[PDB]
DNA sequence: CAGTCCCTGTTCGGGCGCCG
DNA sequence: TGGTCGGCGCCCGAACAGGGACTG
């Protein structure tokens, strides 16, 4: 008996129509059990084929959880609601969250089930549950409450959320709380033990309003990956050719790069393995270059209107490099990931872990998720990615195939 | 209250701001008319159909065709214009059941609902739009106008509404009988239990009573008490299954439409019959105009077709699924980008077979294609069994390790072991990571004139070797490849090659063994003969070394 | 600095097979 | 006679996307 906030799609945009993909027997069993209870509790109810909208559903296990979590791929719906959760009921981003020594993330998604959902909107939350070997047709549902993973859920519940938060916030003014979809980011500068304790306090505070979370981030530890030039006692013609190509590409980012004196070293028509002594002019040109690469790019600043883009490169030996930007060659961050889960045995698990970590950093730093340019074949990613996914949100991605002429990002 | 209501209906709006169909009936031949008039008059007595006064301003064509393998006739309405204006549904049929999915059952019953579409009420408000006018032996007698009271055949909402309605009725029975397996596909029901045969039939009749309560009638004629059952085009036996026999046309002269049937039959056959190959038969269909046109069979499509028929000669069968035992998929390379696979649990007792022939990319190799086949098998298995089979693959463990670790794309194969069945899948050549000491260095380049299509490809080397070759009807890309081909032709067994072509370097670094382009194939041929190749890239127009010199030569 | 042309890869609708 | 609906599969060709290199 709570008022239902009306919702509408962006003008001229119909609802999502996205086929359900095949599910493993364990996931189908988990979903059937989860949906049976949710139907009993009135969160969802069965629907007919007259509803023409569908969204994909599957189940995940969060890190170390061992307990299945229902997950709906609302990316298509969220794109058609976009104006709602940005233009109107959205949330501001605490620029100070990235600065806190410790940040814990809590899944408050369950809270959203309390509030009900606009009756006119429920037609768009439809999802079909598949059956093994197509024994049965698809069992369709729709949401009667605020669904997890929809972008209207945290916005509609923001009024309710702040009141629940407000006693805690006054008690600790310094602590910073940010809400992104199903997640609550809690950033303190306290020592480890005090921090964990304050999270329990905010846990109880959530409990008496009608959920345990153990995912800890330390955004101050986070560093970047500078473009680096090799140090060599002696240089072959091949080494200088590689260096000139890397520096020339880098000059699209740092305009102060100069290759003239290094080019002079390769004037002839020379065998690649011939050793070339460096001249003083090249040593100094190389020195000045290494200094420039330590510096920042001029006039790189985040723009709230523009979308974030993430690019990833597979460097081999369990190493991955990524760049986050909005404009080409204006990079807001660049990083490297090594020795992740599945290192040296599974590229897809590692790429999946990389996408998650990068999305998390973007949420903390800018309160957005980037669109990923993934170095993988579309069919390889779609076959396996859900198997390794442990997050409650899902970024946008596209697939790219760039052979690497030069290793600019890695060494 | 002239018409009774039997089961819960489904609201069905029209597309907004649009109105019901009007279009005149077909000039139906009187012979068909005899069959139609008898059945249609019968419908009104049941309440399936109702007469309408001209207050109903809607007309939609009508026709009929005989039920296959029966004397009965099928009553079908060309609702193409009504579909266009009817609201969209979400189809609930997500795929086709496969017999290899089925577990062994002691007692199996297959039963068919009768007049299944005609037993499900159409939406009350929507009933008006059905209207059609019946025809007579002459054009003198007008014929009655009729509106459906139930789901009709030829509409676009009929299958989904029936399947959803059927599932709702079944759901209470399956909750009371958790240990009965009911495969529900349209109106065909497969019922299997480990109950002893007498007890199983008790449930079967009890299920028939449950369906009877909602007006669903299962005739004895389609009841299947005794094996082998006929289900979804398969023959089901207590311990095995097979496809119902497939007849392949014998024609001495083949048209285009002929090959399509043939191909499509062989694809249906390849789910159990191992080693079916359609590559050369499909080669005949590429870039043809008329479906009617006659085409002669090459000696490749003919040889293929010969052994394809002979594979079908011997009967084969699949077994059923044992959740206790592992799933195993084995793949063989069949040549010309053709792959077949077998999925089994006990050795030599196959659950099903299949083929992956898709040519993907202009340049590729066997390792990529094997990875594609693994993915297709994995997704297919998850549909049928909900798990990924263990893989037996004709590729050495070290070959795979070399490919995936070095490739720039994320790639992966699930748990698998090596099977030493030739032909083995391997990488034909390997590019060096570092420049080769004492090997001649070829600086290569090529250019071409966009207007004339004329160009040059050439090289310069540290030893002083040089070449420039004129080319006709080419492109910049093609000359950059040509330059590399020249360096490979004119070099010893070990060679360093420096190019500024990103296009060429990308093709060659992916280690392709096959290409659509003959020029790339010739480059491959040479790469295989070398002992060591180092390819390196430099940026053009930077005044680098040999690259500047060869650039001047080819630009001229 | 636009505007092409190459070249590649994706998508989508057509035909057939199969099931109601 | 030629003619309907939904699902899945294959193989095709055409239409479209987009990334580099080069032309003014
Ligand atoms: N060629 C078709 N065109 C349109 N719909 C069809 C066609 N064939 C089958 N269907 C649909 C409508 C049917 O109600 C349903 C089942 O078909 P089917 O079981 O073979 O016959 P039927 O149930 O209508 O009568 P019966 O069971 O007495 O043979 O599937
Ligand atoms: O991976 C592409 C594949 O995913 C689908 C559905 O899972 O689309 C989803 O992913 C896209 C790319 O991120 C989103 O743009 C889209 O909104 C989302 O549904 C399929 O549509 C597509 O084939
Ligand atoms: Mg029937
Ligand atoms: Mg040139």
Using an 8 Å Cβ cutoff, are B80 and A39 in contact? no
Q: How many Å apart are CA A369 and CA A363, to the nearest integer?
A: 6
Angstrom CA distances, A328 to A289, A375, B338, stand at: 21, 18, 42
- Residue ranges matching CATH 3.30.70.270 in chain A: 96-120+162-216, 217-302, 303-409
**Multiple choice CATH, B1-92+118-158, 3.10.10.10, 3.40.640.10, 3.40.140.10, 2.102.10.10:** 3.10.10.10
> Which chain A residue lies closest to B406 (C-alpha atoms)?
A316
Structure tokens at A212: 């345990």
B127 preceded by cis ω (within 30°)? Answer: no
- Residue ranges matching CATH 3.30.70.270 in chain B: 93-117+159-227, 228-321, 322-428
CATH superfamily of B228-321: Reverse transcriptase/Diguanylate cyclase domain (3.30.70.270)
Q: How many Å apart are CA A271 and CA A241, to the nearest integer?
A: 11
Chain D footprint bases within 7 A of protein beta carbons: 1-14, 20-23
Using an 8 Å Cβ cutoff, are B513 and B366 in contact? yes
Q: How many Å apart are CA B123 and CA A22, to the nearest integer?
A: 32
Ligand 2 pocket by Cβ (under 6 Å): A 18, 56, 73, 75-76, 79, 382, 396-397
What resolution does the deposited structure have, in angstroms?
Answer: 2.5
* CA→C1' distance for B139 and D14 (Å): 46
Which residues are paired to B171 by β-bridges?
none
- Residue ranges matching CATH 3.30.420.10 in chain B: 429-556
Residue count (chain A): 411
CATH number of A303-409: 3.30.70.270
Q: Is B398 helix (H, G, I), strand (E, B) or coil?
A: helix
Structure tokens at B145: 């106008």
Q: Which CATH class is domain A6-95+121-161?
A: alpha beta
Q: Is A239 labelled as part of a ligand binding site?
A: no
C-beta B160 within 6 A of ligand 1:
no
Using an 8 Å Cβ cutoff, are B67 and B74 in contact? yes
CATH superfamily of B429-556: Ribonuclease H-like superfamily/Ribonuclease H (3.30.420.10)
CATH superfamily of A96-120+162-216: Reverse transcriptase/Diguanylate cyclase domain (3.30.70.270)
Dihedrals φ, ψ of A171, to 5°? -60, -40
Q: Which region, left, alpha or beta, applies to residue B475 given φ > 0 means left and ψ of -120 to 50 means alpha?
A: beta
Is the domain A217-302 a CATH 3.30.70.270 member?
A: yes
**Multiple choice CATH, B322-428, 3.30.930.10, 3.30.70.270, 2.40.420.20, 3.40.190.10:** 3.30.70.270
Q: How many Å apart are CA B482 and CA B470, to the nearest integer?
A: 11
Q: How many Å apart are CA A384 and CA B412, to the nearest integer?
A: 9
Q: How many Å apart are CA A214 and CA A64, to the nearest integer?
A: 9
CATH number of B93-117+159-227: 3.30.70.270
Q: Is A183 labelled as part of a ligand binding site?
A: yes
Using an 8 Å Cβ cutoff, are B448 and B467 in contact? no
- Residue ranges matching CATH 3.10.10.10 in chain A: 6-95+121-161
Q: CA dihedral defined by B317, B321, B326, B327, rounded to 10 degrees?
A: 60
* Cβ-Cβ contacts under 8 Å for B106 (sequence gap 6 or more): B193, B194, B195, B196, B197, B200
In chain A, residues 339-368 whose CB comes closer than 8 Å to chain B:
346-351
- Residue ranges matching CATH 3.10.10.10 in chain B: 1-92+118-158
Residue A233 CB-density burial (10 A; 0-12 exposed, 13-18 middle, 19+ buried): exposed
* Cβ-Cβ contacts under 8 Å for B171 (sequence gap 6 or more): none
CA proximity to B223, closest of B202, B197, B204, B196: B204
* CA→C1' distance for B283 and D11 (Å): 9
> In angstroms, what is the span from residue B360 Cα to ligand 2's centroid?
21
Way the structure was solved: X-ray
């Amino acid at each position: 008996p709570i008022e239902t906030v009306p919702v509408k799609l962006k003008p001229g945009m119909d609802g999502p129509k996205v086929k359900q993909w095949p599910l493993t027997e364990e996931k189908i069993k988990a979903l059937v059990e989860i949906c049976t209870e949710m139907e009993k509790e009135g969160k969802i109810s069965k629907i007919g084929p007259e509803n023409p909208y569908n969204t994909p559903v599957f189940a995940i296990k969060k890190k170390d959880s061992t307990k299945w979590r229902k997950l709906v791929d609302f990316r298509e719906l969220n794109k058609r609601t976009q104006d709602f959760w940005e233009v109107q009921l959205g949330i501001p981003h605490p620029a100070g969250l990235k600065k806190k020594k410790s940040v814990t993330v809590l899944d408050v998604g369950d809270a959203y089930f309390s509030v009900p959902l606009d009756e006119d909107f429920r037609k768009y939350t439809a999802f079909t549950i598949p059956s093994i070997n197509n024994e049965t047709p698809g069992i369709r549902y729709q949401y009667n409450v605020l669904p997890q993973g929809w972008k209207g859920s945290p916005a509609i519940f923001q009024s309710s959320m702040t009141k629940i938060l407000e006693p805690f916030k006054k008690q600790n003014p310094d602590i910073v709380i940010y809400q992104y979809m199903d997640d609550l980011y809690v950033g303190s500068d306290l020592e480890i033990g005090q921090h964990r304790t304050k999270i329990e306090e905010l846990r109880q505070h959530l409990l008496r309003w009608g959920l345990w979370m153990g995912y800890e981030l330390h955004p101050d530890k986070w560093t970047v990956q500078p473009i680096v030039l090799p140090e060599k006692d002696s240089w072959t013609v091949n080494d200088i050719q590689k260096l000139v190509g890397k520096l020339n590409w880098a000059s699209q980012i740092y305009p102060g790069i100069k290759v003239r004196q290094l080019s002079k070293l390769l004037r002839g028509t020379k065998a690649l393995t011939e050793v070339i002594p460096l001249t003083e002019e090249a040593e100094l040109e190389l020195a000045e270059n290494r200094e420039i690469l330590k510096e920042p790019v001029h006039g790189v600043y985040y723009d709230p209107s523009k979308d974030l883009i993430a690019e990833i490169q597979k460097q081999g030996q369990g190493q991955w490099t990524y760049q986050i930007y909005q404009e080409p060659f204006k990079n807001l961050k660049t990083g490297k990931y090594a020795r992740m889960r599945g290192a040296h045995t599974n590229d897809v698990k590692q790429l999946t872990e990389a996408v998650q970590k990068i999305t998390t950093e973007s949420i903390v730093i800018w309160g957005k998720t980037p669109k990923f340019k993934l170095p993988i074949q579309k069919e390889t990613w779609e076959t396996w990615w859900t198997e390794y996914w442990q997050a409650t949100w899902i970024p946008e991605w596209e697939f790219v195939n760039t052979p690497p002429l030069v290793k600019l990002w890695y060494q | 209250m002239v018409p009774i209501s039997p089961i819960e209906t489904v609201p069905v709006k029209l597309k907004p701001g649009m109105d019901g169909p009007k279009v005149k009936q077909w000039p139906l031949t009187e012979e068909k008319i005899k069959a139609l008039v008898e059945i249609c008059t019968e419908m009104e007595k049941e309440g399936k159909i109702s007469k309408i006064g001209p207050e109903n301003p809607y007309n939609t064509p009508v026709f009929a065709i005989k039920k296959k393998d029966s004397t009965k006739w099928r009553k079908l309405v060309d609702f193409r214009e009504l579909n266009k204006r009817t609201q969209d549904f979400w189809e609930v049929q997500l795929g086709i059941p496969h017999p290899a999915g089925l577990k062994k059952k002691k007692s199996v019953t297959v039963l068919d609902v009768g007049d299944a579409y005609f037993s499900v009420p159409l939406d009350e408000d929507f009933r008006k739009y059905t209207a059609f006018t019946i025809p007579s032996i002459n054009n003198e007698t007008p014929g009655i106008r009729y509106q459906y009271n139930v789901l009709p055949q030829g509409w676009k909402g009929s299958p989904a509404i029936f399947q959803s309605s059927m599932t709702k009725i079944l759901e209470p029975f399956k909750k009371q009988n958790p240990d009965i397996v009911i495969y529900q596909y349209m109106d065909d029901l497969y019922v299997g239990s480990d109950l002893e045969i007498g007890q199983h039939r008790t449930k079967i009749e009890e299920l028939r009573q449950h369906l009877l309560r909602w007006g669903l009638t299962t005739p004895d004629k389609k009841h299947q008490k005794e094996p082998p059952f006929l289900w979804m085009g398969y023959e089901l036996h207590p311990d095995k299954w097979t496809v119902q026999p497939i007849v392949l046309p014998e024609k001495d002269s083949w048209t285009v439409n002929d090959i399509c049937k043939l191909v499509g039959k062989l694809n249906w056959a390849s789910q159990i019959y191992p080693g079916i190959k359609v590559r050369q038969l499909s080669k005949l269909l590429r870039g043809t105009k008329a479906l009617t046109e006659v085409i002669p069979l090459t000696e490749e499509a003919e040889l293929e077709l010969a052994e394809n028929r002979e594979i079908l000669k011997e009967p084969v069968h699949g077994v059923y699924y044992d959740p206790s035992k592992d799933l195993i998929a084995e793949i063989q390379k069949q040549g010309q980008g053709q792959w077949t696979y077998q999925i089994y649990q006990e050795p030599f007792k196959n659950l099903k077979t299949g083929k992956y022939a898709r040519m993907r990319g202009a340049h590729t190799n066997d390792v990529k294609q094997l990875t594609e086949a693994v993915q297709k098998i994995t997704t297919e298995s998850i549909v049928i069994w909900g798990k990924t089979p263990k893989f037996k693959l004709p590729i050495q463990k070290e070959t795979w390790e070399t490919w995936w670790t070095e490739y720039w794309q994320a790639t992966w194969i699930p748990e698998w072991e090596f099977v030493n069945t030739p032909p083995l899948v391997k990488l034909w050549y390997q590019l060096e990571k570092e420049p080769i000491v004492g090997a001649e260095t070829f600086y290569v380049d090529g250019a071409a004139n966009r207007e004339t299509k004329l160009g040059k490809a050439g090289y310069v080397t540290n030893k002083g070797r040089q070449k420039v070759v004129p080319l006709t009807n080419t492109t910049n890309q093609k000359t950059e490849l040509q330059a590399i081909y020249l360096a490979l032709q004119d070099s010893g067994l070990e060679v360093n090659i420096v190019t500024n072509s990103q296009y060429a370097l990308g093709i060659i670094q992916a280690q392709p063994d096959k290409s659509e382009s003959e020029l790339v194939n010739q480059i491959i041929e040479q790469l295989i003969k070398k002992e060591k190749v180092y390819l390196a890239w430099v940026p053009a127009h930077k005044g680098i070394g040999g690259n500047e010199q060869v650039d001047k030569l080819v630009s001229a």
